[PDB]
Amino acid sequence: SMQEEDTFRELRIFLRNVTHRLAIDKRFRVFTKPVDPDEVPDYVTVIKQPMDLSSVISKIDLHKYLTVKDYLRDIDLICSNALEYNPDRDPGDRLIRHRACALRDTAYAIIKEELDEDFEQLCEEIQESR
């Protein structure tokens, strides 16, 4: 219905705003775009589902997220990919892992403060009906 279309449109607006706020944070610059294959040639083979914030934006615009829960799976993916690909004790790996966890924590904190639980429940019940 038109009312359900309005619901998903509001969701997309909410998700774009959260994603933009993450993307403009200097700490998360490394997650803003797909990895440069020249800098990490084995990334494509090691990480089976790459994810980044520009890709998240594209997925929002393609109507791929019907719930905030689905969105948070991709945010979690950005984080888990970073922990998987950069597991070492060296400062470089530890920096990106810290930033990865900070990205996840920040996304979850924004959603906790700004997502209405009844709005999310509505989205879930529309998703389940289809």
Next chain:
Amino acid sequence: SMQEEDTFRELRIFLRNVTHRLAIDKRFRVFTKPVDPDEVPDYVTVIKQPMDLSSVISKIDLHKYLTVKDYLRDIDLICSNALEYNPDRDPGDRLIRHRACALRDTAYAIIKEELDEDFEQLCEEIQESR
């Protein structure tokens, strides 16, 4: 169940084989990998969901296709993207559009000859039950 897991495993095997046969065809080399942004800088802005045969393989391996119908949507996407991005009368555009339609026709012809309709129906009914 284990029987349903076997069904989707057979599907993935079937889809990998079809995709490999398309990928080794010289005509379809242009569709084998994501576009080089240096050669087509405006592609990312013009084409909202890029698709290619290496990405199709990754999606198979990530269990993204539960039916051959879902697979054929991405094959159709490779084709429609080519018709959208290369619409002109020039020989270059007409060549890639011909190859795009040939890729689609070839995928559909292989599936018509080699996909058992009862196998596809089973996949669809498992997909619908979830």
